Every structure is written in structure tokens, then in C-alpha cells.
């Protein structure tokens, strides 16, 4: 039943108590142990209590997927169509209606939303649900909401927290109350294991045979560690014997079952029926993170956690408080927005956890080199124009540069294609066959123009799914690209940025892509080496210029599956970098 499921949750007992705490206290810290359902239920409770009469309820989630996942879930519970009373907003996916009482979104959208109205009048209550996997963009929000609260008293702010992080939050938010919302044994090693990988595998071996049935979850650091573990565990399982229950071993890089994942994956997994966790505790992690990890065993039933370090280590060489995760490109975006609110002076800024000065100086230098900031560091005309685009400052810079070069039509398509997850379906039985079809779209210049070739031919075939399948192109991905393209075209048109085509002048198109994306360039070494930092990076085999020789290249992203790899590489001329990417590479007259 919908009611029965809702009432089953631990929060429902404290449901009347939560509403009173919000009604009295302006800012409220909520500690809910995972599986309390504070994420879904609290939003409804405040809606049910009439907080949506004169405002919306907004909740920020750490990832895009989480905001979509919670919104759909809450929609079912509320019993209404997604986007109507309960909707989510994420980048280029605003699933909301005028009739939207409850809204879910990422920190970035809130930052765009707060910049437009520093008082957030459209909202009655703002809740940030990122107890774990908090960033600096989330920390910036805290300081902004602290000021917003001093000018709009009716506004309610809820801030979820981990138990270790809780008291620090309360001190920061003017000593406001900490509302709290209510089994596994943790095992340690007497001496620090010399080899964490060997220890962890032996640990997985003993637990598979010598323990009651449960599923094991292991965490590792690198891909080569994962691959080595898969081979070792296969070899030991086959040698062990046929009587022994089969061990199904699956890795994740986002009879009994073993799952092995990295930190990237740990933040995005809700797998059930696992009674055992192996915690190598070294990426070194924090006590709050270690405790969160321990809890994951306790999800389905009782169970055990195996931390591969001394207890003293837990209490000595591990800090409890979360360290906010800093993304270099996200931080540039955050700083750009802050300067668009007229907030300079990052040194005296009310940061709850001060970011390292290098991170802020690199971000400032990156924006300066893009020409978002002048010599002083004050926001320029170009910076304000870029801040109107909800994307990384490199991509927004490329769009505006293309308008100057009369090639905005091709760029909006290329920019659309960069956001895409998977573009080409590949099946191992027909892998060779798929690669042959991909080759038709290969442009000499590089992957950027190859993406332009894919979308154009898709457009030319009237956007046919049969055509997509004919060429082993993900049909869903192209549809997503068009949705993004249409939204970008509307954003450009609203600002004074027209759409002009130039008949695939590859020189103008790649020149445009050098205006931004100039700190992601590399030169061929007798693989390649990065111009900016000197880091060695390699062409991916799937690249359109992978066979070809190309002395100077430009890459959209830098993936690390095994060794540093450039994602979407395009051959460019050095001249354009001096000319179109001025400040950084003007080592000419």
C-alpha cells in the first residue's frame, strides 16, 4: 500500500515533531541515518502542513541521477504525474509545471536560481540533502543561504548532516538545533597489512567459505587493482574445487555474490542483500565515510565490516569530519556565478570549510585565460555573457566564440554531443561490424567534427530509430542531443547570440574550440604529452584520428580507464592557440 509503505519508515514516528521544529526554527540541521527516508518524506510533510501556500519546497541532491530518482519516487508516493505537483530540475532537464509544489534539484541549478533572485522568493523552504558527498559548490550555498535568511525571515532552511559533521554545522548556522532521526560488528587487523590488495582478496576468500551466506562488497582504488583482483579470485575459486559454491564476481567503475567498486561508484549504489563489507580504507578516508560504508552491510540484515587498518588508525590517522570534494571545472563555474552576484573577495568569504588557495587561484587563472575576468580579476562583459549558460565555462566560451566566427550552428550541435553518455552501441558478437559503421562518420580533423557528422546524417534520415540501429548508434542518446541543442539555441537567442552557419569551415570550427578548451591540448612525443602541465596522455583506439598522425591535438576530456586517455580528440594548428586562446599561449608578437 502507498500509505502503509510511507508509515513503515522510521521518520513517520517523528513526523509531527519535524514540522514543529521547522515552524519554530528558521535553520534546522537534520541527522537521519540512511534508511530513515528523510529524503522523500520530509518534503511531503512540509507540503501536507501547508508550507506550499505562498512558496515552493526545494531539495538539492548531490548528483543529477539522485534528483531524478527521488523526484519520480516522491511522485508515486504523492500519487501525481511527474513534473506536476512534484518535479525535478537538473541541467537541460527542467521537469516542472506552474503547479509544482515540490521541486528537486542539484546544487548547480540552485546556484543559477539564487543568482537570478538572491532572496529566492519563489521558494518557501530550501533543504539541502547532501550529508555525504558534499562539495564546495554546496558550501558556497550555505554562506549564500545564511545571508538570504537575514533578509527573508519566513524562509525555512533544512540542512541534513552526518552525525560527525552535525555539531560543526550547528555552530556555523548560528547555534541552531540538531534534530535526529533513528546492527553490524566492525572487525580490525592487529598490525597494518603491508599489501592492502592481498589482504582484501584473502579476506574475500575466507568469508566466501568460512562464514554464513551473505553478499560481499569490496572497495578498491584503481582499475589495475580491480582487474588483478578479478583474475586472482577466478584462479583461487577454480582451484578450490567443484563442491565449493560458485562465487559470482562483478566489478563496477561508474552460490554467492561479490561486488568490487571504486570511490566513484561507492557514492552511487544502493545494492541490497549484502551482509559483508571489506573496507581497505585508502583512496585514506574519513571516519564518517568509514561508518557510512559499515552501514551498507546493515542495509538488508545484520552483518560484519572488515576494515584493513589498526583501530588507533581510525581514531588517529583518520579525521571524522567530511573533506568537501573539489572539482576543478565545477569550482570555476561556482566562482564565475559568485562574481556575477557581485561577490568578489574569496579570502574573507564566509566559507564553512575554506578551500585550498591553489584551487581558487587555478580557477581564477582559468577564468582569466578564458577572458571571464580582467587583469584585476573583475568580471568582464564576456564573463557575464558566459554566466548566462548553465555549463562549464570552456563550453560557454566556445559557443560565444563561434558566434564571432560565424559558425554557431555547428558548435551548438558539437556542444550538445559532448554532454552525451554513450553514443555508439557495441555488442561483442558484432563488435567488428559496429566499428565499420562508425568509420563512415570519421572526419579527418577529429572526434569533434565526427560528432557533427553523426548528428547531421541522423537529421538527414528524418531522426529514424531504424537508421540509428542500422549504424549501431544509441537512439536515446541522439534524441537527448537534440533536446539539449534546442535548449541551447533558445538560450543563445534570448541573449544577443544568433545562430549562423558556415558550411563546415573546419578551420573556423576548430579555431572556435580553441577559444575555450585550450588548457586541454597535447603534442606527440617520439604517445602524447600535455602542453599545460606536461602530463603524458594517450589517444584512445576509438578516436577518429587514432590511426592518423596529428602533432597538435585538443581533447574535450581526460578519462583514466588504465593510463591517461583523451576523450574526443581533434587535430589543431598551434597558430590558433596563440591567436584564438590569447593570454596563456601568447608567446608570440
Author numbering: 549 to 730, 735 to 806, 824 to 852, 870 to 1112, 1115 to 1177
From the reporting publication:
DEAH-box adenosine triphosphatases (ATPases) play a crucial role in the spliceosome-mediated excision of pre-mRNA introns. The catalytic activation, the catalysis itself as well as the final disassembly steps are driven by so-called DEAH-box helicases. They all belong to the helicase superfamily 2 (SF2) and share at least eight conserved sequence motifs (motifs I, Ia, Ib, II, III, IV, V and VI) spread over two RecA-like domains that together form the helicase core. Two RecA-like domains, referred to as RecA1 and RecA2, build up the helicase core. The RecA2 domain contains an anti-parallel β-hairpin present in all DExH-box helicases, which protrudes out of the RecA2 domain thereby contacting the C-terminal domains. These domains are divided in three distinct domains, namely the winged-helix (WH), the helix-bundle (HB) and the oligonucleotide-binding (OB) domain.
An additional crystal structure of Prp22 in absence of RNA and adenosine nucleotide could be solved. The two Prp22 molecules found in the asymmetric unit exhibit virtually identical organization of the RecA1 and C-terminal domains, but strongly differ in the position of the RecA2 domain with respect to rest of the protein. Although significantly elevated B-factors of the RecA2 domain did not allow to build a complete model of this domain (133 of 173 RecA2 residues for Apo1 and 141 of 173 RecA2 residues for Apo2), enough portions of the domain were traceable in the electron density to unambiguously place it with respect to the RecA1 and C-terminal domains. The two different positions of the RecA2 domain together with the increased B-factor values suggest that in absence of any interaction partner this domain has a high degree of freedom to move as a rigid body. In contrast to previously solved adenosine nucleotide-bound structures of genuine DEAH-box ATPases, the RecA2 domains of both Apo structures display an increased distance toward the RecA1 domain. While the RecA1-RecA2 center of mass distance ranges between 27.3–27.7 Å when ADP/ATP is bound, this distance is increased to up to 31 Å in the unliganded state. The intrinsic mobility of the RecA2 domain allows the helicase core to adopt more open conformations than were previously known from adenosine nucleotide-bound structures. A Prp22 Apo structure highlights the mobility of the RecA2 domain in the absence of any adenosine nucleotide. After the release of the ADP, all nucleotide-mediated interactions between both RecA-like domains are lost. Together with the loss of contact of the RecA2 domain with the RNA backbone, this probably enables a complete detachment of the RecA2 domain and allows independent movement as implied by the Prp22 Apo structure. In contrast, without bound RNA the RecA2 domain is not optimally prepositioned due to its intrinsic mobility, leading to a prolonged ATP sensing time.
